[PDB]
Amino acid sequence: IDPFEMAVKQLERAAQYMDISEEALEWLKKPMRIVEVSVPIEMDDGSVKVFTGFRVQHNWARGPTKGGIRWHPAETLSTVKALATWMTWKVAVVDLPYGGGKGGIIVNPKELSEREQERLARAYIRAVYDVIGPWTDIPAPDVYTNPKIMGWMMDEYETIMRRKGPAFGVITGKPLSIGGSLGRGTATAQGAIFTIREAAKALGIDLKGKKIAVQGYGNAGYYTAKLAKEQLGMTVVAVSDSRGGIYNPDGLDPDEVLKWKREHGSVKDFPGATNITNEELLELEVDVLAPAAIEEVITEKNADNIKAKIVAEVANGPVTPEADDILREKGILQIPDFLCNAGGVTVSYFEWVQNINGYYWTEEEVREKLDKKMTKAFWEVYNTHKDKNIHMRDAAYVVAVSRVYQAMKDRGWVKK
Ligand SMILES: N[C@@H](CCC(=O)O)C(=O)O
């Protein structure tokens, strides 16, 4: 099972639901540019090691491509291509003037020192400089990359560019000291919370006082639970990590659970709470369930047991298509993954706008703009869901691919 083949299959199953020409589909099934480079760095012991780096630009009909950089030992070209393809639809569904992009280096950064990490970031920029830029390709943080590496990459790009333009805007997720944007740390969770609120409004539910269960307690899951409790007024009854789950009918305080996890490395054995595991955690009687962890967690094995009225897929592809079916005929509103967690890329777009313009916004302005963007995206996807009587993930694919196809036709790339 190849990641890129899965992405192409999903695109074809989507195209089954819309009027798109075969030449446009063939165009969309292939990345428009793939760059594979050697990334040589000098190790701390004095030797030179060469790493493999990627930069895939799937499509740029709608504007400059956008996508993060992953530093993973299991990184492959096919994974980067699939993620760039998904980034295209992610920026299209939330209506950004972006295409799809993705980069990566096959490296285990946990065994690299800080100096070696900086050398790796600078060497990656020196290798891929010719295909990136503020108006060509804007990288961002991803798995095992963080704002510190983003700042190193921006500095190297500015050094090569000789400060002839907005070098701050070449890469997003930067520290606030150098062109960073406010509200970027809790972007994904804020977008997920906005989508959950709109979904509840669509379903006729006032979320104040009902239960939410969150799986995965990284930055996405923890902030999802926290913002749910404050903004949506819901009760957080269950959380879990890479070890096990903790459940409390009376409600868990996300700050205390985060303190527990930091102190002991796991959320397990939290005071006044029943210790459980992920598999039985997935089926608590809650109004909202937010899987925010590893992929492929809801499957036909346990899809029928799911009892959440709203499922918000913060993670990337937590739900299999079959589970999508059973969840649909069960009567449950699923927020598609690349619509639910599109808040991060939206706030990255806001950061890029601030960098390009040279004028920086406040927390309130970023928050309000993100609210409007995410509300509009959710409502367009839901209206397509109603009108075409398709699954809501298929509606998200219809919206995104329709936008990209229109942009491609407008440029004259495809004549039909
Ligand atoms: N990668 C995150 C969610 C997606 C994102 O951060 O964009 C996770 O697996 O929890």
Q: Whose CA is nearest to atom 8 of ligand 1?
A: 315
Structural domain count, the chain: 2
Rounded Cα gap, residues 14 and 229, in angstroms: 35
- Cα-to-centroid distance, 317 and ligand 1 (Å): 10
| Tokens found for residue 227 | 């913002």
User: Does 218 count as an annotated binding residue?
Assistant: yes
C-alpha to C-alpha distances, 21 to 92, 402, 405, nearest whole angstrom: 19, 11, 9
Last residue of a domain, one of 178, 197, 225: 178
Read off the CATH number of the domain in which 212 is found: 3.40.50.720
211 HSE (CA, 13 A, CB side): 18
- Give yes or no for residue 83 CB within 6 A of ligand 1: no
Asked whether residue 7 is assigned to any structural domain, the reply reads: no
C-alpha to C-alpha distances, 130 to 134, 136, 186, 353, nearest whole angstrom: 12, 10, 32, 22
- Give yes or no for residue 342 CB within 6 A of ligand 1: no
With a CB cutoff of 8 Å and minimum separation 6, the contacts of 302 are 279, 282, 283
Tell whether 64 and 105 lie within a shared domain: yes
Resolution, given in Å to one decimal, reads 2.6
Collapsing DSSP to helix, strand or coil, 329 comes out as helix
- How many residues are recorded in the chain? 416
Q: Which domain holds residue 336?
A: 179-415
User: Does 217 count as an annotated binding residue?
Assistant: yes
Pair 267, 261: CB distance under 8 Å: yes
Tell whether 361 and 241 lie within a shared domain: yes
- Give yes or no for residue 343 CB within 6 A of ligand 1: no
- Cα-to-centroid distance, 223 and ligand 1 (Å): 12
The count of other CB atoms within 10 Å of the CB of residue 217 is 27
Last residue of a domain, one of 160, 178, 196: 178
Rounded Cα gap, residues 247 and 285, in angstroms: 12
Exactly one of 66, 81, 102, 229 is catalytic; name it: 102
Read off the CATH number of the domain in which 97 is found: 3.40.50.10860
Asked whether residue 20 is assigned to any structural domain, the reply reads: no
The count of other CB atoms within 10 Å of the CB of residue 251 is 14
Tell whether 168 and 190 lie within a shared domain: no
Tell whether 123 and 265 lie within a shared domain: no
Q: Whose CA is nearest to atom 4 of ligand 1?
A: 315
- Cα-to-centroid distance, 16 and ligand 1 (Å): 28
Collapsing DSSP to helix, strand or coil, 215 comes out as strand
Which experiment gave this structure?
cryo-EM
Residue type, 215: Q
Last residue of a domain, one of 153, 178, 203: 178
- Cα-to-centroid distance, 255 and ligand 1 (Å): 20
Our answer to whether residue 102 is catalytic in this structure is yes
Q: Whose CA is nearest to atom 1 of ligand 1?
A: 315
The ligand 1 atom nearest the CA atom of 315: 3
Rounded Cα gap, residues 2 and 20, in angstroms: 25
Residue type, 31: P
Tell whether 212 and 319 lie within a shared domain: yes
Tell whether 139 and 258 lie within a shared domain: no
